[PDB]
Design an enzyme around this catalytic site. Structure first.
Site, mmCIF file in Angstrom:
data_model
loop_
_atom_site.group_PDB
_atom_site.id
_atom_site.type_symbol
_atom_site.label_atom_id
_atom_site.label_comp_id
_atom_site.label_asym_id
_atom_site.label_seq_id
_atom_site.Cartn_x
_atom_site.Cartn_y
_atom_site.Cartn_z
ATOM 1 N N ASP B 25 0.766 -1.245 0.000
ATOM 2 C CA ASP B 25 0.000 0.000 0.000
ATOM 3 C C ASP B 25 0.807 1.311 0.000
ATOM 4 O O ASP B 25 1.290 1.741 1.045
ATOM 5 C CB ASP B 25 -0.913 -0.035 1.223
ATOM 6 C CG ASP B 25 -1.962 1.035 1.200
ATOM 7 O OD1 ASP B 25 -1.853 1.967 0.374
ATOM 8 O OD2 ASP B 25 -2.897 0.936 2.020
ATOM 9 N N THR B 26 0.925 1.960 -1.160
ATOM 10 C CA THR B 26 1.672 3.214 -1.252
ATOM 11 C C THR B 26 0.958 4.370 -0.543
ATOM 12 O O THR B 26 1.546 5.434 -0.324
ATOM 13 C CB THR B 26 1.916 3.632 -2.717
ATOM 14 O OG1 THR B 26 0.659 3.876 -3.358
ATOM 15 C CG2 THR B 26 2.677 2.551 -3.466
ATOM 16 N N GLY B 27 -0.302 4.160 -0.186
ATOM 17 C CA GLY B 27 -1.053 5.198 0.504
ATOM 18 C C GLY B 27 -0.893 5.127 2.017
ATOM 19 O O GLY B 27 -1.411 5.973 2.746
HETATM 20 O O1 LIG Z 1 -8.401 2.501 3.073
HETATM 21 C C1 LIG Z 1 -7.912 1.879 2.142
HETATM 22 N N1 LIG Z 1 -8.632 1.320 1.178
HETATM 23 C C2 LIG Z 1 -10.096 1.285 0.970
HETATM 24 C C3 LIG Z 1 -10.603 2.417 0.065
HETATM 25 C C4 LIG Z 1 -10.059 3.717 -0.142
HETATM 26 C C5 LIG Z 1 -10.701 4.618 -1.048
HETATM 27 C C6 LIG Z 1 -11.881 4.223 -1.742
HETATM 28 C C7 LIG Z 1 -12.439 2.914 -1.541
HETATM 29 C C8 LIG Z 1 -11.779 2.035 -0.634
HETATM 30 C C9 LIG Z 1 -12.160 0.616 -0.254
HETATM 31 C C10 LIG Z 1 -10.797 0.082 0.283
HETATM 32 O O2 LIG Z 1 -9.943 -0.360 -0.803
HETATM 33 C C11 LIG Z 1 -6.400 1.689 2.116
HETATM 34 O O3 LIG Z 1 -5.987 0.958 3.326
HETATM 35 C C12 LIG Z 1 -5.922 -0.488 3.225
HETATM 36 C C13 LIG Z 1 -7.276 -1.206 3.235
HETATM 37 C C14 LIG Z 1 -7.603 -2.119 2.201
HETATM 38 C C15 LIG Z 1 -8.863 -2.776 2.200
HETATM 39 C C16 LIG Z 1 -9.803 -2.519 3.238
HETATM 40 C C17 LIG Z 1 -9.478 -1.603 4.277
HETATM 41 C C18 LIG Z 1 -8.218 -0.948 4.275
HETATM 42 C C19 LIG Z 1 -5.626 3.065 2.047
HETATM 43 O O4 LIG Z 1 -4.441 2.941 1.231
HETATM 44 C C20 LIG Z 1 -5.135 3.514 3.425
HETATM 45 O O5 LIG Z 1 -3.979 2.701 3.764
HETATM 46 C C21 LIG Z 1 -4.702 4.993 3.507
HETATM 47 O O6 LIG Z 1 -5.752 5.836 2.947
HETATM 48 C C22 LIG Z 1 -5.323 7.116 2.395
HETATM 49 C C23 LIG Z 1 -4.957 8.188 3.435
HETATM 50 C C24 LIG Z 1 -3.645 8.740 3.461
HETATM 51 C C25 LIG Z 1 -3.301 9.723 4.434
HETATM 52 C C26 LIG Z 1 -4.268 10.154 5.386
HETATM 53 C C27 LIG Z 1 -5.581 9.607 5.365
HETATM 54 C C28 LIG Z 1 -5.925 8.624 4.392
HETATM 55 C C29 LIG Z 1 -4.476 5.299 4.954
HETATM 56 O O7 LIG Z 1 -5.420 5.128 5.718
HETATM 57 N N2 LIG Z 1 -3.269 5.671 5.346
HETATM 58 C C30 LIG Z 1 -2.792 5.937 6.705
HETATM 59 C C31 LIG Z 1 -2.094 4.714 7.299
HETATM 60 C C32 LIG Z 1 -2.335 3.334 7.035
HETATM 61 C C33 LIG Z 1 -1.558 2.346 7.705
HETATM 62 C C34 LIG Z 1 -0.550 2.740 8.633
HETATM 63 C C35 LIG Z 1 -0.304 4.117 8.900
HETATM 64 C C36 LIG Z 1 -1.088 5.081 8.220
HETATM 65 C C37 LIG Z 1 -1.022 6.594 8.329
HETATM 66 C C38 LIG Z 1 -1.740 7.030 7.019
HETATM 67 O O8 LIG Z 1 -0.820 7.072 5.907
#
Ligand SMILES: O=C(N[C@H]1c2ccccc2C[C@H]1O)[C@H](OCc1ccccc1)[C@H](O)[C@@H](O)[C@@H](OCc1ccccc1)C(=O)N[C@H]1c2ccccc2C[C@H]1O
Lengths: 99, 99
Positions: B25-27
């Site tokens: 996950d690059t996000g």
């Molecule tokens: O939510 C997700 N997908 C879901 C999604 C997103 C958009 C639209 C639809 C869907 C459904 C599902 O795929 C992904 O997660 C896996 C995931 C996959 C499947 C189900 C649940 C979760 C994202 O890539 C998150 O990782 C990431 O989101 C972007 C973000 C960046 C910065 C600040 C706030 C938000 C995020 O929350 N980042 C934070 C984070 C994560 C882990 C550790 C530390 C930190 C700090 C910060 O960077």
């Protein structure tokens, strides 16, 4: 281009004539943007990530420009903390992960 | 290896002699894994995602093998929906985004 990950992979996108900053997120299935106005009809939807679920509005067949590359797809609008470009649009611009 | 995004970028990781499936996950700034047992002391941390914040346990200098590539760094443990390999470890295996 080749994007390293020392910093968050943020890029400039163009949508609805508006210029915005967004995160290339391989962990996001879909694309979700901060509350904004888009044309056409929308459908309610719930998406969940770290922390729980949020309610967004779904728009289909929306044109987005990512670093110059045109892309078409579904775009969600809601109370997201940051603009996110998900897999549904990353595939269209030929984006890949390389170890 | 080159990984397209038509599907979730899921890979197998090895940690604590056990095999698990995780998402590249690059996000994600950090790496967070589902509830499990790790050695040593931990520190508290709060991470915010799409739907809010969650409390996680932080362990340092943890050995983790991602697709055959050995990495050693910070790993978080808490109520995450899926195992996540974030930028802190992605940079250790030399992962980049390309288009
Ligand atoms: O939510 C997700 N997908 C879901 C999604 C997103 C958009 C639209 C639809 C869907 C459904 C599902 O795929 C992904 O997660 C896996 C995931 C996959 C499947 C189900 C649940 C979760 C994202 O890539 C998150 O990782 C990431 O989101 C972007 C973000 C960046 C910065 C600040 C706030 C938000 C995020 O929350 N980042 C934070 C984070 C994560 C882990 C550790 C530390 C930190 C700090 C910060 O960077």
């Amino acid at each position: 281009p080749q994007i390293t990950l020392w910093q968050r992979p943020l890029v400039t996108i163009k949508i609805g004539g508006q210029l915005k900053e967004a995160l290339l997120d391989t962990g996001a299935d879909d694309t979700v943007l901060e509350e904004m106005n888009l044309p056409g009809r929308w459908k309610p939807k719930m998406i969940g990530g770290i922390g729980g679920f949020i309610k967004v509005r779904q728009y289909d067949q929306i044109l987005i420009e990512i670093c110059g590359h045109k892309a078409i797809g579904t775009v969600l609008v809601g109370p997201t903390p940051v603009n996110i470009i998900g897999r549904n649009l990353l595939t269209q611009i030929g984006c890949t992960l390389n170890f």
